[PDB]
Scaffold this active site. Structure first.
Site, PDB file in Angstrom:
ATOM      1  N   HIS B  41      18.029  19.755  16.013  1.00 41.43           N
ATOM      2  CA  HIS B  41      17.292  21.116  16.573  1.00 41.43           C
ATOM      3  C   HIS B  41      18.424  21.432  17.275  1.00 41.43           C
ATOM      4  CE1 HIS B  41      14.418  20.098  19.722  1.00 41.43           C
ATOM      5  NE2 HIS B  41      15.998  20.761  19.781  1.00 41.43           N
ATOM      6  N   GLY B 143      16.705  21.299  27.449  1.00 42.05           N
ATOM      7  CA  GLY B 143      18.089  20.936  28.236  1.00 42.05           C
ATOM      8  C   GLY B 143      17.482  19.228  27.986  1.00 42.05           C
ATOM      9  N   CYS B 145      15.449  17.103  25.822  1.00 38.19           N
ATOM     10  CA  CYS B 145      16.447  17.015  24.864  1.00 38.19           C
ATOM     11  C   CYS B 145      17.089  15.863  24.289  1.00 38.19           C
ATOM     12  CB  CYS B 145      15.385  18.318  23.472  1.00 38.19           C
ATOM     13  SG  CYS B 145      13.311  19.099  23.873  1.00 38.19           S
TER      14      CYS B 145
END
Ligand code: U0Y
Ligand code: U0Y
Lengths: 304, 304
Positions: B41, B143, B145
C-alpha cells in the site's frame, strides 16, 4: 493508536557492552571511547562481598588482572581507577561504535530503558522507572551487573544507571555512571531495606492522558479538585504529592486533550477512592506510573 | 529476580530499516541482502486505499518511482515485484548490516518484539503477542507501517510480522514477510471486525510459573483439576482450551518449580472464579498472557 511500555532501540548500547572478568567474577562493562566502566565489586570474592574494603582489595589488582572482552576479542587494559562504586578501565582502543553520549543522574519518577546483559552479550531490553525509594524493579540474574539504563535524545545516549545489587526483597539498586548509588544503598551483602514505594502521581496522570488520546475514556468524571484537596487523597493512597511543576509538565497533554490537569486529578481521585470495578485502562487493571509526561508525548508523536 | 515484559535487543533489526517513498506515501522497509520489503500500500493514494487494485496500480509504477533511503543515502532500485501484500524492491547494494535471518509465520499465542519505526528510523521496541483472533495490540502511528516483528535465536533474527493496518477498533493487522496477512484481514480501508480476543491460557500458566520462580506465591492453592474440568472453566472465561501439547510445553517450568501443570491449572481456575481480590502478581492486577513458556525459561535463565 495503541499504547505500549516502550524501550529505546538498544543498538547504540549493544555496541558498548563488554565482558569484565577479575579472578572468578565475570560482569558486564560499558565501553565508551577508551574507557570501560563496571561495578567495582567485580574485584570481590563472594566472601569479600559480606564486608569489602574496596581500596584495600584494589591494591592486590593490576591492569592485567582485569580481563576485558568485546565480542571474542580481548582489550588491553593500560590503566584502572575507582570512582565511587565503579571502576574505569583505560584500554588502548577507543570503542569504534561509541555513540554520542552523556552521563546523567536522574530523579525519582524518571524512566529509562535497561539493556539486560550477561557475559557482555545482550539478552533483552525493558523500560524501568527510578522508584521514589531509589530502587528499580528490574529483571536481573547473577552476571547481569554492569548492565546499564539509558535514554536517547535523537543521536545522544544519556546513560543514567548501572546495575550493582539485588536487595533481599528482590528489588534492584545501582549507581549513575559516576558510580554514585541511587538512594542510600551500598555495594555490600548486608540487610538494606527499601523505603515506601510510593506511586509516581505525575506519571499516572500522563498515562491517564495517554488513555484518553488512545480512546479509553470511561474513567473521565464530572468533577475537578485543587492541588491541596488532591494531595490529601494522594497522601492517603501512598501517591507522591503533586506540585505546580508537575501541573506545568502536564500542560501539553492538557492542551492536546482539552482536559484541565486538575480535572484529570479529580478523575484519578475517584479511581483511587472507588477502584477500577473490574475494568481496565490501556489493558491494565492498575494505575501505571512508569510513563513520564515526556514518554507519553514521545510515544504519541512517534519521535525517532 | 524480577520479571519484566522484555523485548529482544533491536540493534540487528535497526540495521535493516529504510525509508520507502512512492509518490506522497512514506513508509518503512526492511533491507535484507539486496532486497527491500515493504507493504504494497506504499503505492496507494489515500483515495486508492478505499478499494485498491494493486496489480493495476503497480503497472503505473517503475523502479525509479520507489525512493529507498538508508540513513541519508539513496539506494538504486533495479527491480520490483509484488508477493501477496508486500513489495520486494531489488536494490544494487546488499545491506552490509544484514544479520543471519529467517522468515517465519508464527501461530496465535506466539510473542515477538516490534521495532516501531517512522521514516526508516527506530522510535522504540516493545513485546507483542499474535492474538488468537490474529490481531496484535501494538503502538503504531501513521508512517509506522513496514515496522517489523521478530524473534532472535542467538545470532539469527526470525522476522514474523510486518505492520500494514489499524482496524477501526485501534488494534493492528499485518503480514508475515511473504506478505500473507495474519487472520482474514485485507489491505483495504473497509470495515473489518476482529473476532473474540481470547486469553492465551498456556501463556498465563507460564507467567504463573514465572511468578512462583520470582517469589509471588499467594495464589498457589490446595487443589488440582483435569484438562477437561479446567477447559469447562476456560471456555466460560474466554480462555483458549488447554491441550496436552500445552502441558508438554510447560513440563520444564513444572519440573523447576515442582508444581504439576494441572495443579497450576487449578490455581488459575480459582483466580478466574474468585478474581485477584485487589492483589497483584508480578506487579499486574490481571492475568498476563503475552509471555510464552519459552519466554519464561529464556528470561529466567538469561539467554543471550
Ligand atoms: C551484581 C551481580 O551480578 N553479581 C553480584 C552478586 N553475585 C554474587 O555474589 C554471586 C557469586 C556467585 C554465585 C554462584 C552467585 C552469585 C552475583 C554477581
Ligand atoms: C499503515 C500506515 O502506516 N499507513 C497506511 C494508512 N495511512 C493513511 O492512509 C494516511 C494517509 C495520510 C494521512 C495524513 C494519514 C493517514 C497512513 C499510513
Amino acid at each position: 493508536s495503541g499504547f505500549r511500555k516502550m524501550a529505546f532501540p538498544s543498538g547504540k548500547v549493544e555496541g558498548c557492552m563488554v565482558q569484565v572478568t577479575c579472578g572468578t567474577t565475570t560482569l558486564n562493562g560499558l565501553w565508551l571511547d577508551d574507557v570501560v566502566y563496571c561495578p567495582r565489586h567485580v574485584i570481590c570474592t563472594s566472601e569479600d562481598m559480606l564486608n569489602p574494603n574496596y581500596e584495600d582489595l584494589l591494591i592486590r589488582k593490576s591492569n592485567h588482572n582485569f580481563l576485558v572482552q568485546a565480542g571474542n576479542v580481548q582489550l588491553r587494559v593500560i590503566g584502572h581507577s575507582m570512582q565511587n562504586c565503579v571502576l574505569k578501565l583505560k584500554v588502548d582502543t577507543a570503542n569504534p561504535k561509541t555513540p554520542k553520549y552523556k552521563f546523567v543522574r536522574i530523579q525519582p519518577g524518571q524512566t529509562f530503558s535497561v539493556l539486560a546483559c550477561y557475559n557482555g552479550s545482550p539478552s533483552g531490553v525493558y523500560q524501568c522507572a527510578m522508584r521514589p525509594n531509589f530502587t528499580i524493579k528490574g529483571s536481573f540474574l547473577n552476571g547481569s551487573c554492569g548492565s546499564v539504563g539509558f535514554n536517547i535524545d535523537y543521536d545522544c545516549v544519556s546513560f543514567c544507571y548501572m546495575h550493582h545489587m539485588e536487595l533481599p526483597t528482590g528489588v534492584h539498586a545501582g549507581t549513575d555512571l559516576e558510580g554514585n548509588f541511587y538512594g542510600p544503598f551500598v555495594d555490600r551483602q548486608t540487610a538494606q531495606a527499601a523505603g515506601t514505594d510510593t506511586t509516581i502521581t505525575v506519571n499516572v496522570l500522563a498515562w491517564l492522558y495517554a488513555a484518553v488520546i488512545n480512546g479509553d475514556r470511561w474513567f473521565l468524571n464530572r468533577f475537578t479538585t485543587t492541588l491541596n484537596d488532591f494531595n490529601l487523597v494522594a497522601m492517603k493512597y501512598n501517591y507522591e504529592p503533586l506540585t505546580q511543576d508537575h501541573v506545568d509538565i502536564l500542560g501539553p497533554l492538557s492542551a492536546q486533550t482539552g482536559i484541565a490537569v486538575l480535572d484529570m486529578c479529580a478523575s484519578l481521585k475517584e479511581l483511587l477512592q472507588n477502584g477500577m470495578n473490574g475494568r481496565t485502562i490501556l489493558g491494565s487493571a492498575l494505575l501505571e506510573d512508569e510513563f513520564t509526561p515526556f514518554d507519553v508525548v514521545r510515544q504519541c508523536s512517534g519521535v525517532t
